[PDB]
Amino acid sequence: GELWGIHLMPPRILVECLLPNGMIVTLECLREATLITIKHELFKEARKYPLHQLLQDESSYIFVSVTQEAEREEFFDETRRLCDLRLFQPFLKVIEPVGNREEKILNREIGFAIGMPVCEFDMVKDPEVQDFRRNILNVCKEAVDLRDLNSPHSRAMYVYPPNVESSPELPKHIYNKLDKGQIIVVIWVIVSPNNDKQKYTLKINHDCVPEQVIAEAIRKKTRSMLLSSEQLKLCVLEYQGKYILKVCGCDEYFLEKYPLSQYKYIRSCIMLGRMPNLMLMAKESLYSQLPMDCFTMPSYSRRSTKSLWVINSALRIKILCATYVNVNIRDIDKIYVRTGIYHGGEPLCDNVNTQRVPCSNPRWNEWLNYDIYIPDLPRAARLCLSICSVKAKEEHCPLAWGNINLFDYTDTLVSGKMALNLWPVPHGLEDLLNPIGVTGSNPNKETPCLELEFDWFSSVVKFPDMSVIEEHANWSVSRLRENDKEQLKAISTRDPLSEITEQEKDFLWSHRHYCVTIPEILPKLLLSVKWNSRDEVAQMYCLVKDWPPIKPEQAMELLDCNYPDPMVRGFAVRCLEKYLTDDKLSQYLIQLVQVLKYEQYLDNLLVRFLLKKALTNQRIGHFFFWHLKSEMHNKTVSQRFGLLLESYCRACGMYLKHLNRQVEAMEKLINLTDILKQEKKDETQKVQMKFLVEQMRRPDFMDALQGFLSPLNPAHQLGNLRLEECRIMSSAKRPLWLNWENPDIMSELLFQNNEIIFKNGDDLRQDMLTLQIIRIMENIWQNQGLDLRMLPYGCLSIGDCVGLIEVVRNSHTIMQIQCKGGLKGALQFNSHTLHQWLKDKNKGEIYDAAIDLFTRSCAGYCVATFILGIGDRHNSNIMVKDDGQLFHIDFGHFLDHKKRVPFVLTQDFLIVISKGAQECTKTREFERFQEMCYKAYLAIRQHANLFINLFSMMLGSGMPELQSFDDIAYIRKTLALDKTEQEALEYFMKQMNDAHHGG
């Protein structure tokens, strides 16, 4: 709200103005009054108060006030309205301005973007935080220098990067829809001040580059001009260098020389058999809407020890006492703190506990001794601990937890007294320790605080430099085969979570030198290393230093929580930054962001890689921002992501201006829904609707919600609202159904209106992960040649249980379609009603295409939902377009409700698949339908490693569906990865014939 506890300011309010002299002046001012108007009328009114003789000229002052974020903000940007300041109370203090104005104005804009004030970072004591802020600014200048290099083109390649598939090589079923290897494409040209445009239809090779398209168009128009070969060249040269191509209806551009069929828009136009509509556009016009945007270094940017391997002693730690522990003294017997030394998820040594202690006096003062030699500590070692209660049988429970890095970001071993506040234990966790949790102290006040002391060895202790580590390997190494070859390869085939016994892992460690001939084995070999042996670790470091690059789908496993060593993770990053395309990065960005939570320190190779890419490609930068911004509420990562967001916003250039327009749009919508969720929940639907339309008709709302980019896809501009069609929805949490006009000059060639759902109250990150995973399966099937059409509609979480969802035009639930039909049996709907409605919307020759689309899409979702355990869906959770394309919705709703059928294949579907036949399960349409399902099932099983890694990387999300690897084991059952293909195939057939029940 514009004031604390107030949604909107009245049209006129009183503002307490504090002058540089101790006079206080009440100024009545409009809600919309700009500070320039406030300051001029204040000093105009001040002449009515004492001691005006001491006031300097109006221009020598600015306003400072307190915002609802508790920030004393200097209002250097005097052009803002009184109501946009986010004031806590309506007052203004007059001061003389100090410091760089441009910096202060820019920091405020960053604060609005990331949702927290930047000055909160200036106060942080931690040196790791201040070093991070200064030490990644070079990654920012690397990116800005690079994209400003070949201006303006390099700048356009950042804002409008080519949207292309990862490989130009078409699969046969796509190539077969080309007319003898060619594609027909239409070029449009706005040609009138009124805007009247024209079109030119072309037939060209699918692999022509954009400049060649422009050559065929100008060649087709100069057909009758009687040009010589060289004269034709010059005007081809004129137009190749003067114009570029744009997709009609959205802001996608063809700026580099990928073959035309590799641009996704056109790869799909072939796949879908639709006409590619392009617009020839002047380059000087595109570069005009790319205003120059600089990057300035901020103020903060500019202004003996012995080795671990000499310490001859075992590890010990003193656990002193606790504070603020909340426990019922008469229900709980005693408390004790549990500790363990971990490397990832594997204890480096056995756990040890304090003595049990009365709940009324949490004090131990015990030195816990650990069975590990200090030199044997790996760099990525972590102390994991919790405070546990005990209550006949004896059973324990954790009360709060906390993890600690035995080495800090400077490679030094911790020493001296330490005190950290513990975190709440997550819902449904019974394990006494939480190693996958973040390392750090809980900033929330009045929380259980635990105190420790680490041994002090007369001086600072540092981890050995890589110099001596390699020599220790040369020291220990001094202290082909056939049948063994086939087993090593036989182990690389097994999934990341396959059971790996002792004989197999030390067998890998024995043949660790032969493993570089099958680099896919590296994850298995790393889990085989005995990490509590500095001999093996040193020997292992030398192997990964020379390891052959593995491809990204395998390297991503080495960023999950089971591979915390910086050398290992560094090898994984280098794999990505040399083999991971911007296409596949943009897809896997959800996982790649949230493995940052496993990073031991703020400054690491992974964040520098993602940040570098986000600043050089504004498409992945857009979602890079929102996936971080969506987690700001979470205090376990609010700081890490906050600092990371600060850097991005400080260097993303002019796009920050657009992002803030989105943030403001969502901040307005989340406010209206919050009002409807509590202030008006107690009132009728029609009453809520009348408040909505009134509230949306207000000008300030329309000015904030009209004319901005869609967070689901910034290539979609959102113009005027169709208030005619926006509404609340029947759902209990009452989301908003919103409709914008597409302002594109040629919007009619893609869509004239853009419809989106905004839901405030529901956790959407499950639907994100599921819809993402579905898109991966669709891309796998398409690459293989299975033309199974899925509908991974757009869905984006932007914060705590709030986000956006793409509306699929011309779509209905199977429940709605059943209600369009009638009853056949006693109170029974007609099973043929689905098939009938399809024939209604698809008449004549186009009928077969709709049936094929239904059968293919249905086959896809049957395989997908089964594998992921999303079997039983309500008939209102399944949907189908007039097109005949079938898809599912509300995945989180399904997981949230599940707290018998493998997949929904009701008679209604079976009818349309068999085109309305009797005993439909015995026709040749059904015969080749289940053949599609079988091929699609084992097609995913072939890629089971990728999916298991993607879910493994989400464990730190805090999604209750992903708390431990045991949650991921379900996909090993559905894919039957502990069985061979023909066994897995028979398993899936058996399951479908339970969905059909065998009759």
Binding site: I24, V64, V66, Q68, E69, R72, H396, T501, E502
Partner: protein, 270 residues
């Protein structure tokens, strides 16, 4: 016989055995028929170093073992040999003996007459007691997180009151700095009129500072009281957790009497 042995549980999942060696002492052990679901192939898992270390039991010519040189006649001979002596002569870095087993029925804690009502009545009772207490635990965790966020909203609000009061106090200290000797001048010029203009505005300054100071303590009061009711919701959950865990296991293992027959009829009534 192996089929009747304490430590052979059969086709248990890796997750179900991981749930059973949780936090156990070095030397606890348990064996399965391998997850690969192939006849006559078995895996040993025991606790050592806070880890569940799996070992494959190879089988050839009716003999048994877990290394290439294969010897033993039965798995019971293989296991009891290492219940006696240390296994360190094989895979020597680990050395703990096969100390403590966990078994499939040595905890069938049904007290009295083994009527089937011990399932059809006492199981439905515990499961009812379990879902009720699980519903309360979920309700607690809901208002627990609600109260948690309403607290930090108040902590930042009072922290904002701190900055507004800091800014009004400096206003009073500058009001006395720049008005002191203008008062002293109006004092001897006999201009009580202007002196009362200045004082009338000063009183208004420190009149409003008292309103926001009061607004702060009135909010600090709501924080003190909601912060305490938050601590109560915490210790209540911590009291419900070990209970919820206890009668969950009881509900779980009262399916033993159901698994004894091994058909769903006696739960199918529910």
């Amino acid at each position: 016989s192996l089929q009747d042995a304490e430590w052979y549980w059969g086709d248990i999942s890796r997750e179900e055995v991981n749930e059973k060696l949780r936090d156990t002492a070095d030397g606890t052990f348990l064996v399965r028929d391998a997850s690969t679901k192939m006849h006559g192939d078995y895996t040993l898992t025991l606790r050592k170093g806070g880890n569940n270390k799996l070992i494959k039991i190879f089988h050839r010519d009716g003999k048994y073992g877990f290394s290439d040189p294969l010897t033993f006649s039965s798995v019971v001979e293989l296991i009891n040999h290492y219940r006696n002596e240390s296994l360190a002569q094989y895979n020597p870095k680990l050395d703990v003996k096969l100390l403590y087993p966990v078994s499939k029925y040595q905890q069938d804690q049904v007290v009295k007459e083994d009527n089937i009502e011990a399932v059809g009545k006492k199981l439905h009772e515990y499961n009812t007691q379990f879902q009720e207490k699980s519903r309360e635990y979920d309700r607690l965790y809901e208002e627990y997180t609600r109260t948690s966020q309403e607290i930090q909203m108040k902590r930042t609000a009072i922290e904002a009151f701190n900055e507004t009061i800091k800014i009004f106090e400096e206003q009073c200290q500058t009001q006395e700095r720049y008005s002191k000797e203008y008062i002293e001048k109006f004092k001897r010029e006999g201009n009580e009129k202007e002196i009362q203009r200045i004082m009338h505005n000063y009183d208004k300054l420190k009149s409003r500072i008292s309103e926001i100071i009061d607004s702060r303590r009135r909010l600090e009061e709501d924080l003190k009281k909601q912060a305490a009711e938050y601590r109560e919701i915490d210790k209540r959950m911590n009291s419900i957790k070990p209970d919820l865990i206890q009668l969950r296991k009881t509900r779980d293992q009262y399916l033993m009497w159901l698994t004894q027959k091994g058909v769903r009829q006696k739960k199918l009534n529910e």
